[PDB]
Write a protein that binds this ligand. Structure first.
Ligand SMILES: Nc1ncnc2c1ncn2[C@@H]1O[C@H](COP(=O)(O)OP(=O)(O)O)[C@@H](O)[C@H]1O
Ligand SMILES: Nc1ncnc2c1ncn2[C@@H]1O[C@H](COP(=O)(O)OP(=O)(O)O)[C@@H](O)[C@H]1O
Ligand SMILES: [Mg+2]
Ligand SMILES: [Mg+2]
Lengths: 527, 252, 186
């Protein structure tokens, strides 16, 4: 019948591998034996349709122009240097070798930084077909592997349909929210991703409906996740982890005045002559309303301002309106982050610390007070929703403070006998980690001696029982939080020098940085 | 045949996107060869029933007029000045751009303040279709994303059901008790401007455009709402009433 | 096996990109401490693809990788410090631990918690597990007994209040393998 040729003449432009051609031939021979209206005929016809629809030997016309690719990547996103560099390296490698290539990448970082959005821009830059495969909460393994022909509603699954609909064998597949894939009871879809995302086994990915391996080695797989700790290790080891670090206030201003404001004006239908947002207004808005690492809340604030102005214009209340730092609260409300520092001058017994928080880092203070009226042995009570690690660090800090005061001032009986209460005034929010050990030691020693620390000094670092300072994480956020406040001097572990000097120049311009190996140096710096 | 002509008459007035049209064409060709008694015929007929019932190109005629909408809002409820201001701003933006638009809002406050009645009033003022479903205590993702055609009990989920019922691509959808959800990963895809325009349902196997849908969420406390879900939507506080306001509401 | 295949994929001849045994050894020591091979392959491919980008863009005609400029290709090293104490003071003894990223060493620090050196006590911190805390208790008892039989006049362990810490404070650790280390530290 004409169905056989309708199958055959659309393999002409495909370089079909032998292991597929020999299956197509036997299925076609079976097709001519079955009755034209039998159910087996329909099953064979559907299977032949699925086999024929695959782009067996055709690729998209990928362009290798580095300048054009960089121009396309820069026109949509700001300051994603790592991802752009990775894509330019991909293009250069694919240009040295005479054929297209495929890779498996995973973008991870805080929400709202552009992980999902950059994928489409990359696909446009590479001139590759784009497909989004959101796996959030997915518990059906059949979406990846499919069902055997025997079932009535059998379909190959999402990936084979990506190849079918994109009509190219090297698309860009976005596996969105890979860390949020569901823990299904009847099946584990993340275990099926091991075959899909295997850098060596992509060439033989076997679909349960097709029962034929497909070469997925030319497909560029991009995954997005919020945290890497949730992704299974056998799957995490296959993917290339590259980080998106989030945006600093200056980068937020660049994004807003270069991408967010123009797009929000286009969405609201306004023009620069009718609604003007100056750099001072955007800077104030970012400073006082948009502390999060992403730019989604900043986008919402900008749209709020523009919609307020649009209502003011359409209703006839004003022909045009300009936003100023004085009247911005009329549009967005009163400021949220109105205070940066709890203590302008620290009394004896309190020391300024640094903490990592989701809102671009924040500072903390460690307060100590004399719980019972005398300057058997002393005790230390700790409050402030401290985690178990932080409570252990407080105990270590107390022991080392006792030991240090034993030798620096043997006549000082304060820490040995006095009953002390230690608090971190952010009592409503949980806090954990050993980063505040040296801060706790400094607070205890300042309380014991009655001498306040340097009035614009911030510090962080894990402490050992013998007083050695150990490296800590979150240096960028702690430095940013310190620079927001009037911190003139910062104390960091010596092992953190390498990733402190990896920060941008404008972040560390005015900080008198001290790097320490043992607490005896922090004692000299603070006192 | 009669079935094909019925499905095409269902499809006459819709401005269908090219990919959906290709899917409908290939499914109609598949149905043209299957025997009527086949179970696969039943599956294909049930699939085409949903694809031919989605309002691919129908939009409700909104009342883009500040005066009438303000009159309706101030005649239906008392003291909800923040919500009314937000809706007037929405109308002004829709008028200035000259096209319909969609937004994702969230009304949070103590129970009995009027979060659902105000949403019905907003749908009345905007001349938009109204639909609501509750996610409180929900633990099944499949009731939003649907089940694929293979399973016998597959359904296309609440969003596709709403689209079929309202017959418009710009209705007002109320998601009730977002803070009492158990499942949130489906909502993250459901209400996200980057991917609203290409919302893919497992049953449909074809994307629908939800960019013009006005989503309104309801809750009582913001802190219990999932963190990645709290970032997509806009929080508007529907606070409680003082004795004078309660007396005015009771009298009026 | 890895470098030749990565070159064949990136298309770089040995003359255009130099990866010596010294830089490979440094890269393995500082970036690929795991038991697997995939991450080492990824690091090698990163180095070769950055060299390829430098060659294609016209920035250089040939790229030489050295132990000094390796961090320009693979970033800051993951592992730099191999032992916490160069010279151990009296209270601390070096131990050994099992870890997925190769072997890991640990130290056991002890110090007086109260000035005088009526039972004494041992405070145990460092995210120690139940089995490891039990081993610490057994070690404390045996240390008391051994110091009793070795130095009868030395009543340090029975009267002094001692804090024992394992300075990997944020990393949980469990197992009885540290019993002799704890006895030695005490
Ligand atoms: N660097 C950037 N430049 C311009 N716009 C950005 C940038 N980063 C994020 N955005 C905007 O912010 C939004 C972030 O959403 P999304 O890309 O989904 O972030 P995530 O992937 O973290 O969920 C996008 O709509 C994007 O337009
Ligand atoms: N400001 C108001 N003006 C008019 N009616 C109100 C007002 N606040 C509450 N109501 C009435 O109270 C009822 C509240 O029910 P509902 O809105 O479903 O509860 P909830 O606010 O907890 O969602 C509505 O029927 C509404 O008519
Ligand atoms: Mg995303
Ligand atoms: Mg209600």
């Amino acid at each position: 019948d004409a169905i056989e040729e309708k199958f055959r003449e659309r393999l002409k432009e495909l370089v079909v591998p032998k292991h597929v051609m020999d299956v197509v031939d036997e299925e076609l021979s079976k097709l001519g034996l079955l009755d034209n209206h039998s159910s087996e005929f329909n099953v064979t016809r559907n299977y032949l349709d699925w086999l024929t629809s695959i782009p067996w030997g055709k690729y998209s016309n990928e362009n290798l122009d580095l300048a054009r690719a960089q121009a396309v990547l820069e026109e949509d996103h700001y300051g994603m240097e790592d991802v752009k560099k990775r894509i330019l390296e991909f293009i250069a490698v694919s240009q040295l070798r005479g054929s297209t290539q495929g890779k498996i990448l995973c973008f991870y970082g805080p929400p709202g930084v552009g992980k999902t959005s950059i994928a489409r821009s990359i696909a446009r830059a590479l001139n590759r077909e784009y497909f989004r495969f959101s796996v959030g909460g997915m518990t059906d393994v059949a979406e990846i592997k499919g069902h055997r022909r025997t079932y009535v509603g059998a379909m190959p699954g999402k990936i084979i349909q990506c190849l079918k609909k994109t009509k190219t064998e090297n698309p860009l597949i976005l596996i969105d929210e890979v860390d949020k894939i569901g823990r299904g009871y009847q099946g584990d879809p993340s275990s099926a991703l091991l075959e899909l995302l295997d850098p060596e086994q992509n060439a033989n990915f076997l679909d349960h409906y097709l029962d034929v391996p497909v070469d997925l080695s030319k497909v560029l797989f991009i995954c997005t996740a919020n945290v890497t700790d949730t992704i299974p290790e056998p799957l995490r080891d296959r993917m290339e982890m590259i980080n998106v670090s989030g945006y600093v206030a200056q980068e937020k201003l660049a994004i807003a005045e270069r991408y967010l404001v123009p797009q929000a004006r286009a969405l609201c239908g306004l023009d620069e002559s009718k609604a003007k947002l100056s750099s001072d207004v955007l800077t104030l808005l970012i400073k006082q309303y948009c502390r999060e690492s992403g730019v989604r809340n900043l986008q919402k604030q900008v749209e709020k301002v523009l919609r307020k102005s649009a209502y003011k214009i359409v209703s006839g209340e004003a022909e045009s309106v300009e936003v100023t730092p004085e009247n911005l609260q009329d549009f967005v409300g009163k400021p949220v982050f109105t205070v940066e520092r709890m203590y302008d001058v620290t009394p004896p017994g309190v020391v300024m610390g640094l903490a990592w928080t989701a809102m671009g880092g924040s500072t903390l203070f460690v307060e100590t007070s004399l719980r019972r009226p005398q300057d058997k042995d002393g005790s230390l009570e700790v409050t402030g929703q401290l985690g178990e690690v932080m409570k252990e660090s407080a105990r270590i800090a107390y022991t080392f403070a006792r030991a240090f005061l034993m030798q620096h001032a043997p006549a000082n009986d304060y820490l040995v006998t006095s009953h002390i209460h230690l608090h971190v005034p952010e009592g409503a929010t949980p806090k954990d980690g050993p980063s505040a050990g040296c801060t706790i030691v400094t607070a205890l020693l300042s309380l014991a001696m009655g001498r306040p620390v340097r009035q614009n000094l911030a510090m962080t670092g894990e402490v050992s029982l013998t007083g050695k300072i150990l490296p800590v994480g979150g240096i960028k956020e702690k430095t940013i939080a310190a620079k927001r406040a009037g911190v003139t001097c910062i104390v960091l572990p010596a092992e953190n020098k390498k990733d402190f000097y990896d920060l941008a120049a404008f972040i560390t311009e005015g900080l008198e940085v001290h790097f320490v190996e043992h607490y005896r140096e922090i004692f000299d710096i603070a006192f």
